[PDB]
């Protein structure tokens, strides 16, 4: 019975902390940035969460007075929460799919990457959510007990569609993304190692006397340069041409040192710095910058997805347990009591969502950086 008071305080806290931040995010993202295929999805998700939190007061009013005013509210208010759940799940799986498909072939990257396509797909998402929602409105009546055979079927259908299939799709997509991301790292690591050995060999060769250490350092440099050139477009051709020039200069230095000349070998070795800086530095800088960008986004998506699933799982666990377990048992007496807190958490998810955007990213300077 105290759990009922826990439910009402949870609902009240969500209502008080959900309207301001969500409306703030909606306004900031709506009237500051410029329409792109990426931020429209987060705008739709925030709008759905705001619509969910806008119908909270009535649930609290019902829960405070055990509704002696109209049958319409008992049939409408439970529908909005389910519509919120369906729209949020579908938008999250669309976001995941798009993020995993960006790194695919350019066929889908250049095909129809336009804002109109995003608007149309969001329209289809909302339509499907509404069609899936209508059953809940239809199968609900006042006996003032507000509850529901079709019960055994509706719960299974909802569990299958809104929680099982999209979960598998997102898990597979993010597993593929992380497996592909862990691969690029090794290649960058190897290229950095080759650059490092080239660098310190070129450093030692300057201070090295006699023609034997010069040949040894040049041999190590040549091996490193060949290995780096093997690692892998106009920039690609440019990269390979730069390494070909570098290997040519290394050969010139080696042939000069073979004939027992030191100072000329030193000058030939010093000559490689200009070509190195003019050719490979820009590619190295791009390869560093062309990495963090992805992380600042993959983590932002993964945290949102995981938090959503964690907040919504008790709802379906308790739904299944109420479906299988028979009533008229002392278990049901507390099962009904705990159903309220489960639903309260499932509805409270909307307060958790808008804080992660600020935590993981001026109001604009943070929100716009998060929505990238
Ligand atoms: C979201 C929601 C909210 C509901 C309650 C309610 C709100 C706040 C709190 Cl703290 C406690 C109760 C409510 C009361 C009066 C009014 Cl006017 C509106 C809502 S019922 C309900 C819901 O969707 N039920 C599902 C399946 C039910 C069984 N599922 C289990 N067991 N997991 C459905 O009907 O299809």
Author numbering: 20 to 85, 88 to 164, 170 to 174, 331 to 365, 1001 to 1049, 1060 to 1118, 370 to 439, 449 to 459
Quote the paper:
Anaphylatoxins C3a and C5a, generated during complement activation, exert their pro-inflammatory and chemotactic effects by activating their respective G protein-coupled receptors (GPCRs), C3aR and C5aR1. These receptors are expressed on various immune cells, including monocytes, basophils, eosinophils and mast cells.
In contrast, JR14a-bound C3aR-BRIL shows high structural similarity to apo C3aR-BRIL, with an RMSD of 0.5 Å for 224 Cα atoms, adopting an inactive conformation, characterized by a closed intracellular side where TM6 remains close to TM3. This inactive state was further supported by the conformation of conserved microswitches, such as the DRY, PIF, and NPxxY motifs, as well as the toggle switch, all of which exhibited an inactive-like configuration in both the JR14a-bound C3aR-BRIL and apo C3aR-BRIL structures. Specifically, while a significant portion of ECL1 and ECL2 was unresolved in the apo structure, likely due to the high flexibility of these extracellular regions in the absence of a ligand, a specific region of ECL2 was well-resolved in the JR14a-C3aR-BRIL structure, by participating in the interaction with JR14a. However, these conformational changes did not propagate into the TMD, including the conserved microswitch region, resulting in an overall inactive conformation. Notably, although the binding mode of JR14a remains largely conserved between the two states, JR14a is positioned ~1.5 Å deeper in the fully active structure than in the intermediate state. Our results indicate that the JR14a-bound intermediate state has a larger ligand-binding pocket (647 Å3) than the G protein-bound active structure (575 Å3).
